[PDB]
Amino acid sequence: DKGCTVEELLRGCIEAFDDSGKVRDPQLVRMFLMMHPWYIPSSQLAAKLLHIYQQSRKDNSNSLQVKTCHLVRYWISAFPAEFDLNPELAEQIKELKALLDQEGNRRHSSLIDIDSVPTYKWKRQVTQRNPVGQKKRKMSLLFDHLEPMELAEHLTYLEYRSFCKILFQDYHSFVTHGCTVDNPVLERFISLFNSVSQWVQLMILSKPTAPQRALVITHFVHVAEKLLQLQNFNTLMAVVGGLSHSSISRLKETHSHVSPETIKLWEGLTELVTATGNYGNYRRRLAACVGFRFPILGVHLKDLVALQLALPDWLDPARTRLNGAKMKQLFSILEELAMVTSLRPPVQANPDLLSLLTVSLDQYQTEDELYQLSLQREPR
């Protein structure tokens, strides 16, 4: 309950299984199997499971043996990416498999298989590569004639394709450091977020006359409306907040040319993602969602960082008893972030437009450059 240690909690996770393999209370075992890197490295936890299995083997306790093997099986099936990525954890599982082949006589050895995992480690190491001298201004001419919904859909896909590459290790490193330090996957996701926002900014500042800029503002308001209809709150923030960047907000003359209906809908969307009330509107809408949903990562990262800094990991100075509340609260967030990968967005997307969109999102301008462009479009 309150004041548990990693040994007691691991034993509790072992006891949670049945001799047949049935899991009695899956919430506890799912909690500890995801949350334990916060307190103990995964290789060390695997070593502890190994020692428990060996010690139970010496005492001929068949129940403890098969329960431990079922726990390891559930661990492998639930989080395979970590078993592929972590070499020391895989070595511990190798040693345990050898112990099963020796003492179990292949009775429980079939219960553990490490290459049944359809995983691609290099997915997180692979970075994109696109031709030089593209002059990919065709997207500029194209998005004017692009249906808003369609555009929204494609954006969703892109962001979702990045979000799935984030593992628990990345969330842990972020919350521990407060920022992305040696965290290229989450860094790439955040960079894509800001690339979407800056793309909105550039697409708006590209037009030379104020009514045209107001027209593209209306267009992006519609793609934000469709993102909300898509239940994609993350990219919504990307474009809505991109519509409120300093460079575009100070464009008073183009802001005169946007229709009042567009203004009403726009301020409604901005109110949806307000930080007032601790993002209460967003949290309520997300809770009311059914089916696929894309939460705005950054609100939940804010919650995780607040929990990490406010509450202590351990309750004793010896750092052996786990703060049960914190672990639960953190879990309640992270599991949600995990469940996002369970469902795919109901989105059709042709890869050609994906490529065009990625190439357009690639271009980077400093904040000062966009502000200078805004000054060119409308001086003081």
Partner 1 sequence: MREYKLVVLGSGGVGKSALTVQFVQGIFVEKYDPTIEDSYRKQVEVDAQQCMLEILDTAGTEQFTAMRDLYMKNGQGFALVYSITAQSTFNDLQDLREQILRVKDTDDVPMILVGNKCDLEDERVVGKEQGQNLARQWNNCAFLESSAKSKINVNEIFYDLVRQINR
CB of 127 to partner 1, least distance (A): 19
Strand segments (E) across 85-193: none
Q: Which amino acid is at 246?
A: S
Q: How far is CA 248 from CA 188, 242, 251, 259, 371, in A?
A: 25, 8, 5, 16, 8
Nearer to partner 1, 5 or 180 (CB): 180
CB of 296 to partner 1, least distance (A): 8
What is the rounded (10 degree) CA torsion for 89, 323, 338, 30?
A: 60
Nearer to partner 1, 329 or 355 (CB): 329
- Give dist(CA 156, CA 150) in Å, integer: 10
Nearer to partner 1, 43 or 329 (CB): 329
CB of 94 to partner 1, least distance (A): 37
Q: What 3-state DSSP class applies to 116?
A: coil
The residues that touch partner 1, with contacts defined as CB under 8 A, are 174-175, 177-180, 190, 193-194, 197-198, 237-238, 240-242, 244-247, 249-250, 270, 273-278, 280, 283, 298-299, 301-307, 309-311, 325, 329, 333, 367, 371
- Give dist(CA 155, CA 143) in Å, integer: 12
Nearer to partner 1, 3 or 298 (CB): 298
Nearer to partner 1, 85 or 307 (CB): 307
- Give dist(CA 88, CA 307) in Å, integer: 30
CB of 37 to partner 1, least distance (A): 19
CB of 358 to partner 1, least distance (A): 19
Nearer to partner 1, 60 or 366 (CB): 366
Q: Which amino acid is at 126?
A: V
> Smallest Cα–Cα separation from 348: which of 141, 200, 152, 146?
152
Side-chain-facing half-sphere of 28: CA atoms under 13 Å:
18
CB of 146 to partner 1, least distance (A): 21
